[PDB]
UniProtKB/TrEMBL annotation, chain A:
It is found in: Secreted; Bacterial flagellum. It comes from the Bacteria. Signal peptide: none annotated. This is Flagellin. Flagellin is the subunit protein which polymerizes to form the filaments of bacterial flagella. FlaB is not essential for flagellar synthesis and motility. Residues 1-54 form the Flagellin C-terminal domain. The gene is fliC. Belongs to the bacterial flagellin family.
Length: 54, 55
């Protein structure tokens, strides 16, 4: 029983996820998605300077 | 003089407009990426310092 407890602890250190870290990464990538979407939508409007010159 | 064959004001306006467009594209890239240094064009010593800190 002792050894089972210690070995399950050891395995958990390797296999399981950390919620405190992974939620932070998720929120960071959410914000980056919104920023990149805005920036790409603004980037697709660059060829319209030619209509002004034309 | 009143000339038709050469227009210098247009040449200078073209160069200013090109400079402005280049600056805007650079800013757009930096906001899309989230990083100040995207190449070694930007900051060369900071690139190496940051590679070591990343290691």
């Amino acid at each position: 029983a002792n050894t089972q407890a210690n070995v399950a602890d050891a395995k958990s250190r390797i296999v399981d996820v950390d919620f405190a870290k992974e939620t932070s990464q998720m929120t960071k990538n959410q914000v980056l998605q919104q920023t990149g979407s805005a920036m790409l939508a603004q980037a697709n409007q660059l060829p319209q300077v030619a209509l002004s010159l034309l | 003089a009143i000339t038709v064959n050469t227009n210098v004001t247009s040449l200078k306006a073209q160069k200013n407009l090109n400079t402005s467009a280049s600056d805007l594209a650079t800013s757009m890239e930096r906001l899309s990426s989230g990083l100040r240094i995207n190449s070694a064009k930007d900051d060369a010593a900071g690139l190496a310092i940051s590679n070591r800190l990343n290691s």
